Design a protein around this ligand. Structure first.
Ligand SMILES: *[C@@H](*)C(=O)N(c1ccc(C(C)(C)C)cc1)c1cncc(Cl)c1
Ligand SMILES: *[C@@H](*)C(=O)N(c1ccc(C(C)(C)C)cc1)c1cncc(Cl)c1
Lengths: 306, 306
């Protein structure tokens, strides 16, 4: 029992983190086989970052302008190219610690682990969700760009996020590992802003099931609701719609607890309309939406990775 | 910016996790140099665990009764001994992945990272605090005993916790790495129970400072309080007393924010007496007490580890 914001073990990613320096700009890179991936804004300067012409900036660089440090060992750069908003630095050494990996792009509502890094050195690990508005509520300081987000499935690391920037509300934006931004953000200094968010309804329901599995049942009730009637309430509280596919994905948790999905929707409806009245659920006084149905099954059943 | 429950990178500990089997009982062990450490209740059987005589049980075992698996490689046991509530299995191979390490015992109120493991394979990582009542609110399923808790300081892993059991309220008890239980718990099946807990006042204050550093200021006020007058309120809300040493430890955060410690105590007092009135602090609707002043400085300043 218990229920925690649980990240994947980070060892496989730690062995891929390096430091990339261009000029006086230093950030994190990801070393897989003989390529180092990093944000292209490593080639910018204080005045460049207003409205940079990255193609122009890059043609003016040479391999020797990029210093890559893997621990206390320097990696000779032998080639460079731009792919969307990431740089690909070809180095003369394949990373012997390269795990089996994939570059995957995730959906809003999906979760991943972040290995926050500074100067190529891992600092901490935590779990994040991709918000509906394509930001993430991370924890990042200056010099963290290039830190990556990932999931692990058995032995394979699916990289899904590379950190680039902080938005004015303190949330974070970045790209997939092909360099394509999540959401309507650009790697330059504009007035860009996050844009309105919603609550991830299917995840809230998954977390209520986690709570029942763990013995919190006070919010259960005898009522039920229809899917359409629930979605009317969801819209009014800024929750996103629940679909039949969400209902289906919640099937296993429904079957394990014996609480019909639409019955749990009725419970969520009451919680939205009445608040929590001084009580908590799994140690939270808020409805938590950064656990997917998979996260709940993983933690309340116990899947490992090797 | 941002503020997350952030664990240490787990790679250095992942390389130490092994599977220990005795009879039909399988759990996790920690392999450092040529010793595997694991809970002594690996030698128990369904009927043994009522009131086991562990000295009796152990004299009846041989080295060959212990199978240690490090991944898909079997470690030959060449010696065994009991140290309090842990077993020390001498193996014929020193772990080449042994980090620099220490065995430290922590104080209630202190935090650490847990690498949850099953069958010697890491499953997830999360941050925990030692409660005042010497339990931890972990996330553990059957087969997790032997998973360890730790902190990392530069390159050195300070192991502080080995998981043994779940108490009836769903919280967790275990030992330090010398086998000495945290709190009044025993590795047998009795009616033992957690006992009354309190809230870690100095940590709540640290987290309020984290919030101010991150731009949540709505709970600030012009009032101040004396240390004695604050502690009268703390006692009434089941918070533990604040000492002058706590005030001193909060000095740096006080100086960074310009909010006197006793001024933040006045804010905490109002929050305890009035609740939060529908607002949140760092994404929580509860006063959070599992971040130490060190955790706040680490995350709001950015210290790495190598
Ligand atoms: C990601 C990153 O490193 N970065 C950044 C680049 C350059 C500098 C100067 C040293 C030239 C001031 C600082 C930070 C960055 C962060 N967020 C957005 C953008 Cl466009 C770049
Ligand atoms: C830690 C652990 O493995 N364990 C446990 C031992 C033995 C068994 C049987 C297979 C013999 C039923 C199950 C679990 C354990 C957990 N919590 C408390 C105690 Cl005393 C032992």
């Amino acid at each position: 029992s218990g229920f925690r914001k649980m990240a994947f073990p980070s060892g496989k990613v730690e062995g891929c983190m390096v430091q990339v320096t261009c000029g006086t700009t230093t950030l994190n890179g990801l070393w897989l086989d003989d390529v180092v991936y990093c944000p292209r804004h490593v080639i910018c300067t204080s005045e460049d970052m207003l409205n940079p012409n990255y193609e122009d900036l890059l043609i003016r660089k040479s391999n020797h302008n990029f210093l890559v440090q893997a621990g206390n060992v320097q990696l000779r750069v032998i080639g460079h190219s731009m792919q969307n908003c990431v740089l690909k630095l070809k180095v003369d050494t394949a990373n012997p610690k390269t795990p089996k990996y994939k570059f995957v792009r995730i959906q809003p509502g999906q979760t991943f682990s972040v290995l926050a890094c500074y100067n190529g050195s891992p600092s901490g690990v935590y779990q994040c969700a991709m918000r509906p508005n394509f930001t993430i509520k991370g924890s990042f300081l200056n010099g963290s760009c290039g830190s990556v987000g990932f999931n692990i499935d058995y032995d394979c690391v699916s990289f899904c996020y590379m950190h680039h920037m902080e938005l004015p509300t303190g949330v974070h934006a970045g790209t997939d590992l092909e360099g394509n931004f999540y959401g309507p953000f650009v790697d330059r200094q504009t007035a860009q802003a996050a844009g309105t968010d919603t609550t991830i309804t299917v995840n809230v329901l998954a977390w209520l099931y986690a709570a029942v599995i763990n013995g919190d049942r006070w919010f259960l009730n005898r009522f039920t609701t229809t899917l359409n009637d629930f979605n009317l309430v969801a819209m009014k509280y800024n929750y996103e719609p629940l679909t039949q596919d969400h209902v289906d994905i919640l099937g296993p948790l429904s079957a394990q607890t014996g609480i019909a999905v639409l019955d749990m929707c009725a419970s969520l409806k009451e919680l939205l309309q009445n608040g929590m009245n001084g009580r908590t659920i799994l140690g939270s006084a808020l409805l938590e939406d950064e656990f997917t149905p998979f996260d709940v099954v993983r933690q309340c059943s116990g899947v490992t990775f090797q």
